[PDB]
Amino acid sequence: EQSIQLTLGPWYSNDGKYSNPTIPVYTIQKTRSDTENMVVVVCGEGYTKSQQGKFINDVKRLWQDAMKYEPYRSYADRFNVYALCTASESTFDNGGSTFFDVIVDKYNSPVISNNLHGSQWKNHIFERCIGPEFIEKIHDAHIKKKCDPNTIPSGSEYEPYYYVHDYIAQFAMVVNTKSDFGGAYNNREYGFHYFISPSDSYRASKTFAHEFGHGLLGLGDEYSNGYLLDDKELKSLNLSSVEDPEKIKWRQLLGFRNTYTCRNAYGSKMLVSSYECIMRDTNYQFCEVCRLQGFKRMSQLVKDVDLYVATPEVKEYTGAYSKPSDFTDLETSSYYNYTYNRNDRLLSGNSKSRFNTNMNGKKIELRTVIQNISDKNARQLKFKMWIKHSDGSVATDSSGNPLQTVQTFDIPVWNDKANFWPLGALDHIKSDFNSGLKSCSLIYQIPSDAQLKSGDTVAFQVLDENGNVLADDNTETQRYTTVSIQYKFEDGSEIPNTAGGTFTVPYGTKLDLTPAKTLYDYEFIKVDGLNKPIVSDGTVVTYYYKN
Numbered sequence: 001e002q003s004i005q006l007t008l009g010p011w012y013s014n015d016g017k018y019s020n021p022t023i024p025v026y027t028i029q030k031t032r033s034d035t036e037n038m039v040v041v042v043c044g045e046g047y048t049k050s051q052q053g054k055f056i057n058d059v060k061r062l063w064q065d066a067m068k069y070e071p072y073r074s075y076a077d078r079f080n081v082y083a084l085c086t087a088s089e090s091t092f093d094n095g096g097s098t099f100f101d102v103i104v105d106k107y108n109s110p111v112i113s114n115n116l117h118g119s120q121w122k123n124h125i126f127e128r129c130i131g132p133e134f135i136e137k138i139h140d141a142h143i144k145k146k147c148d149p150n151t152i153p154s155g156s157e158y159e160p161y162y163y164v165h166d167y168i169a170q171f172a173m174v175v176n177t178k179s180d181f182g183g184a185y186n187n188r189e190y191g192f193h194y195f196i197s198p199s200d201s202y203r204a205s206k207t208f209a210h211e212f213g214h215g216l217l218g219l220g221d222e223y224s225n226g227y228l229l230d231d232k233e234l235k236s237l238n239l240s241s242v243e244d245p246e247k248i249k250w251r252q253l254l255g256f257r258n259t260y261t262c263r264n265a266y267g268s269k270m271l272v273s274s275y276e277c278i279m280r281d282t283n284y285q286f287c288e289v290c291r292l293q294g295f296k297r298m299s300q301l302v303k304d305v306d307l308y309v310a311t312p313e314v315k316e317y318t319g320a321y322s323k324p325s326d327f328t329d330l331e332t333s334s335y336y337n338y339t340y341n342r343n344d345r346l347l348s349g350n351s352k353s354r355f356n357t358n359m360n361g362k363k364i365e366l367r368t369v370i371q372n373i374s375d376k377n378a379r380q381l382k383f384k385m386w387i388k389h390s391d392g393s394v395a396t397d398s399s400g401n402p403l404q405t406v407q408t409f410d411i412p413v414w415n416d417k418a419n420f421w422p423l424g425a426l427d428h429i430k431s432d433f434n435s436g437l438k439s440c441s442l443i444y445q446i447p448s449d450a451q452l453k454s455g456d457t458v459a460f461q462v463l464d465e466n467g468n469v470l471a472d473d474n475t476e477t478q479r480y481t482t483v484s485i486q487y488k489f490e491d492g493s494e495i496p497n498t499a500g501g502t503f504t505v506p507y508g509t510k511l512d513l514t515p516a517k518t519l520y521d522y523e524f525i526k527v528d529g530l531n532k533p534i535v536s537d538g539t540v541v542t543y544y545y546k547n
């Protein structure tokens with residue numbers, strides 16, 4: 001029913017196997033107007049027409065797993081996700097004609113092969129054919145096509161299609177295969193912004209999150225080798241070759257969580273902010289630098305995100321790893337020695353119970369990093385930290401003074417915002433890592449006469465100017481709950497060509513997004529389940545549309 005149709009002349013389907021394909025469109029998630037959200041378009045490679053059910057379910061699995069990683073997770077409901085059911089003649093594993101002509105080269109890279117059948121523009125198919133048709137017919141902006149993709153434009157072959165990657169935030173191609181591979185193609189100047197990954201490899205979801213991190217977040221391979229020259233130093237979001245801790249771009253994050261610059265391998269001149277990152281080893285999470293940069297990157301594509309507060313931590317303050325000179329050694333063993341010291345000192349998250357009565361007379365530090373997303377509003381955040389008894393009462397010293405301290409932090413504006421992957425950008429060239437960024441550290445001296453009890457813990461809050469709690473001593477370990485969206489007509493029928501996905505939110509979250517006024521051609525009526533604490537897995541938010 002709902003679909004797009006392409007016209008693929010000899011430059012896109014030289015063997016005539018896909019000269020005029022019909023592509024069913026499935027909406028996996030549309031929580032707001034496309035104009036307000038990041039639009040992701042996923043196509044299948046090597047799925048035959050009878051395998052499109054598998055393709056849809058593969059996309060839902062990969063997408064849901066990607067949304068469990070920060071920083072995506074913080075934006076989970078600000079994506080609209082569409083599955084385009086591109087049908088191949090052959091399965092991928094059978095090796096016959098496929099929709100995207102994908103081959104695996106001698107480096108294990110999946111590549112769209114223009115030379116396979118002589119389709120000279122095959123790897124331009126996303127931004128010249130699929131994208132413009134989708135943006136005209138399906139996307140809420142309905143930008144009418146500007147150029148015939150089977151003709152040579154006057155002037156640039158590329159500029160007429162630049163707009164595609166501003167209305168579609170990411171193209172993904174899922175290959176129907178168990179083969180383990182992955183590749184991301186980011187060259188917007190020449191029209192390329194897609195990645196390819198497999199549906200059923202042993203690490204399929206981790207690979208998907210990684211390639212999406214290259215493609216959408218603009219992060220570099222923390223497995224890369226070589227020395228970054230000054231231009232490439234400024235260009236990289238998450239890599240460096242600057243040995244001096246007083247000069248390295250991410251110096252404000254040094255000592256926060258597992259942020260300790262090190263060589264990404266013995267004797268390497270390529271430096272990473274943490275040895276344990278998915279951008280180097282797909283078994284890990286995103287490091288704090290990648291979370292910050294990716295969160296900043298996505299904030300450019302939506303309008304209502306104005307602050308990043310990394311999850312704060314509390315540590316016994318001994319003076320270790322508290323000054324730049326403590327970070328000068330860049331060997332892997334220095335990274336791990338640092339993380340062991342951090343664990344020995346940690347008093348938050350899963351180490352909250354390490355507090356004890358021997359803590360009197362000691363100092364503790366509440367530490368996080370804050371990025372202002374506004375290029376016009378400076379911010380002032382108030383930090384509170386205190387010693388809490390197990391029953392919730394606030395501990396005191398021997399004079400009845402509560403064991404508590406407060407400090408306010410000024411967050412400067414993001415003056416450099418326009419240089420960091422804004423809408424319309426073709427690349428990231430140079431940005432000031434520290435613009436809008438503020439590492440906040442609140443040190444509390446526990447008095448020698450603290451009246452501590454077994455089971456006491458460190459409590460804390462990060463408050464905004466209205467007193468809203470942005471983060472506290474429960475944030476890091478709080479339970480997340482799964483929510484699933486469904487699209488229905490007034491009469492309870494499921495809307496065709498929808499396949500509502502799930503995502504997760506902190507237990508108790510009240511969802512607050514404004515539904516898109518249209519779904520395909522159907523007009524929105526009402527929604528059940530918004531503005532209501534989400535307190536059970538499988539909670540269903542139901543969007544009702546008028547038939």
Ligand SMILES: [Zn+2]
Pocket residue numbers: 210211214221
């Ligand atoms: Zn990679």
Ligand SMILES: [Zn+2]
Pocket residue numbers: 222238277278279286287288289290
């Ligand atoms: Zn990283």
